[PDB]
Design a protein around this ligand. Sequence first.
Ligand SMILES: NC(=O)C1=CN([C@@H]2O[C@H](COP(=O)(O)OP(=O)(O)OC[C@H]3O[C@@H](n4cnc5c(N)ncnc54)[C@H](OP(=O)(O)O)[C@@H]3O)[C@@H](O)[C@H]2O)C=CC1
Ligand SMILES: CCc1nc(N)nc(N)c1OCCCOc1ccc(-c2c(N)nc(N)nc2CC)cc1
Length: 186
Amino acid sequence: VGSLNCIVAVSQNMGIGKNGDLPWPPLRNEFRYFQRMTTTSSVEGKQNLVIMGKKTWFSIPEKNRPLKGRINLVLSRELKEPPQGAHFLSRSLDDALKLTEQPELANKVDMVWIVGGSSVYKEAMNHPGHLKLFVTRIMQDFESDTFFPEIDLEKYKLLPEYPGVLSDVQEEKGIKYKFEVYEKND
Ligand SMILES: NC(=O)C1=CN([C@@H]2O[C@H](COP(=O)(O)OP(=O)(O)OC[C@H]3O[C@@H](n4cnc5c(N)ncnc54)[C@H](OP(=O)(O)O)[C@@H]3O)[C@@H](O)[C@H]2O)C=CC1
Ligand SMILES: CCc1nc(N)nc(N)c1OCCCOc1ccc(-c2c(N)nc(N)nc2CC)cc1
């Protein structure tokens, strides 16, 4: 099993969600970036795994789930089996990370990508170890009911460049945004 990473898009006011959807109008190319980064494995014969909370799973349009070309794992303590279309269900983040190391998935899983929401991000971000955050900075305020946790810059270093990640300002639907990659190792 390869690297552990979080990926998020976030507004200036740290918003990630509103009413079970994104706070901003759909950004097609941002979604294409998310798909590209999470799907692409750097190892032959292997697949990346995505971990998400229950509400995140149901926020994804049915036509886009499961997230194609990746193993889809949902976190829930209420569910008794994986949701329709999903591949796996775990009851904690630790339990999910162990499952990747079982004979089942040990040699099929390359990268692990936590794709939301807040509580999964928080726990991952504050757990000791090697972790990268792929953060899309939406450069406006958007009314939100769900927020990204604090990035501690004492631990997380913003990388000055990263292969496959554009460094200039993007714009869709009159909304500017930029891609960032952070790395910690503790
Ligand atoms: N902008 C972005 O990049 C992203 C935005 N979003 C948006 O964020 C919102 C969804 O996020 P959020 O509200 O934080 O909800 P989550 O997706 O984190 O779902 C919360 C539920 O998942 C389960 N859960 C979460 N963590 C764990 C855990 N560690 N172990 C076991 N179960 C867990 C619980 O289900 P149970 O109660 O069944 O135990 C919990 O009620 C939506 O508005 C969505 O559109 C989501 C992802 C990314
Ligand atoms: C892509 C957002 C996103 N971006 C980044 N950098 N990280 C994430 N974790 C993330 O979250 C993925 C989990 C949410 O996934 C989706 C799927 C599709 C859509 C949708 C949608 N709900 N409605 C439309 N019309 N289009 C799209 C594609 C635009 C929104 C969110």
